[PDB]
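Help! Submission page says 'invalid entity' but I think these are all valid:
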Amino acid sequence: GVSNLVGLPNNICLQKTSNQILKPKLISYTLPVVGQSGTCITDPLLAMDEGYFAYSHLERIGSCSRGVSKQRIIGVGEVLDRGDEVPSLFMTNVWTPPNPNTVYHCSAVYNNEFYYVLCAVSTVGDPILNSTYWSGSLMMTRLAVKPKSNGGGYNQHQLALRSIEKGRYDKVMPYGPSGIKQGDTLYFPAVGFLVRTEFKYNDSNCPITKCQYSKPENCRLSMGIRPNSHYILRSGLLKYNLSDGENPKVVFIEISDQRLSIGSPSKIYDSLGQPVFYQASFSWDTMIKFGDVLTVNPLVVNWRNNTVISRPGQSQCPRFNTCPEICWEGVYNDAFLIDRINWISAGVFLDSNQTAENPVFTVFKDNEILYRAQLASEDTNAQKTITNCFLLKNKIWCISLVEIYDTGDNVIRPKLFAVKIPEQCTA
Ligand SMILES: *[C@H]1O[C@H](CO)[C@@H](O[C@@H]2O[C@H](CO)[C@@H](O[C@@H]3O[C@H](CO[C@H]4O[C@H](CO)[C@@H](O)[C@H](O)[C@@H]4O)[C@@H](O)[C@H](O[C@@H]4O[C@H](CO)[C@@H](O)[C@H](O)[C@@H]4O)[C@@H]3O)[C@H](O)[C@H]2NC(C)=O)[C@H](O)[C@H]1NC(C)=O
Ligand SMILES: *[C@@H]1O[C@H](CO)[C@@H](O[C@@H]2O[C@H](CO)[C@@H](O)[C@H](O)[C@H]2NC(C)=O)[C@H](O)[C@H]1NC(C)=O
Ligand SMILES: *[C@@H]1O[C@H](CO)[C@@H](O[C@@H]2O[C@H](CO)[C@@H](O)[C@H](O)[C@H]2NC(C)=O)[C@H](O)[C@H]1NC(C)=O
Ligand SMILES: *[C@H]1O[C@H](CO)[C@@H](O)[C@H](O)[C@H]1NC(C)=O
């Protein structure tokens, strides 16, 4: 079957090459995302663990940003080899909340037959864009990956969050596609909203050395979505111990201050016997942020010193920016570690400076891109990108979800690709 990337997988190519040895296969049609002309599919989540996956999206009628929310899909299922010997996703269980207008920022963790999905519940829109008026309310659903006919609360049911420990943070919420379980406590990528006049930051920790026109205040102002924001954002994890009587709390853990950046969508995952953490770059530090997790609680991450991977921005903080500016921009494009011995990772990235376009599956190390494969056209518009890799017959496969703009219908939709990591550098 399909299993996590653990133990001693088949060899992969380790050399920088321009040979086309990556051969992505399009596998969207196994999920309900091929879509209908007058509908936009937005706000996707994909998560994978132990032969299962959780998937979520919102469908809007008309406009992609201001359209009417038709339905929120939350499904789980299994990753299975089609006869082809190629992995693909198959739903087994799907749920829709009663009110699709109010669910935001879902995040999934798998544990022993069930996926847990933590979401924000808001009556004032995306909580990030109006945080003062957001109530801070949360919701968690449990889905069985193996539905059992008329299974009452086994198949689906919601859990009650009657206690949130958030220390000195006003509000706390899930903020990233997926997390990890730890026999058997759950950890969700999350973010904390700290009242700005409580943020202890020493401006003399802001790298201005040969950054022309970069005031040392910039690193503190950029910790909120706006230089005058009431809150600043701090990434971290939400802990949820399943073995806590009957009302397990949720405890916020903040990310350490090494290479601090405004809280943004993040991800924690298990690769080869140890957890990795990825944090999207939504401000001035535009080089990819991920690394082995030194310790989970408290959270400290051994950020890689990657010099080749970045992400497109706008005028102020374009791709490859490293100088402290005041900005809130960027895109979520994560990377999955596939070989620790050599620290090689795979991800889909947008190969452009100031426009979100040209999605390229790329395998890479800290200072070298080894090889790559265009996923669409060089002026294809794209956004969020979520990669998970695993084993199929001891061979490493990755599955990437990529938000692509469809020029026919003028709407975005998730495309799924399955990519085998080449076991040799010649075709
Ligand atoms: C995120 O969160 C909150 C929602 O809780 C939102 O605040 C609300 O925003 C709307 C503005 O879009 C505002 O409604 C407008 O209010 C003014 C009257 O202003 C004052 O009246 C209230 C009565 O007690 C008082 O409580 C406050 O002092 C309030 O400031 C009104 O002039 C507007 O009407 C406009 O003109 C035409 C008239 O025909 C309307 O038909 C049309 O709808 C117009 O918008 C409008 O009603 C509302 O009062 C705010 N709610 C409160 C509690 O403050 C934030 O705006 C939002 N923040 C972000 C970044 O999105
Ligand atoms: C990346 O570079 C730093 C500095 O050379 C390495 O050492 C520590 O890294 C962390 C992460 O940014 C810093 O917060 C510490 O101050 C560094 N300690 C020092 C000065 O030795 C780090 O190990 C490198 N990461 C990699 C790729 O292993
Ligand atoms: C996209 O942005 C990058 C970063 O500024 C540009 O690449 C740099 O181009 C300058 C030209 O002065 C070189 O000195 C640097 O070495 C480049 N940085 C690296 C290592 O990539 C790039 O040219 C931009 N794309 C364009 C031309 O629009
Ligand atoms: C950090 O440095 C700045 C400037 O020297 C200072 O304001 C601050 O007090 C220092 N650290 C602390 C908390 O003492």
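Support: the input was valid. A stray whitespace character was the problem, and the output above is from the cleaned input. Residues 319-320, 353 surround ligand 3 (CB under 6 Å).
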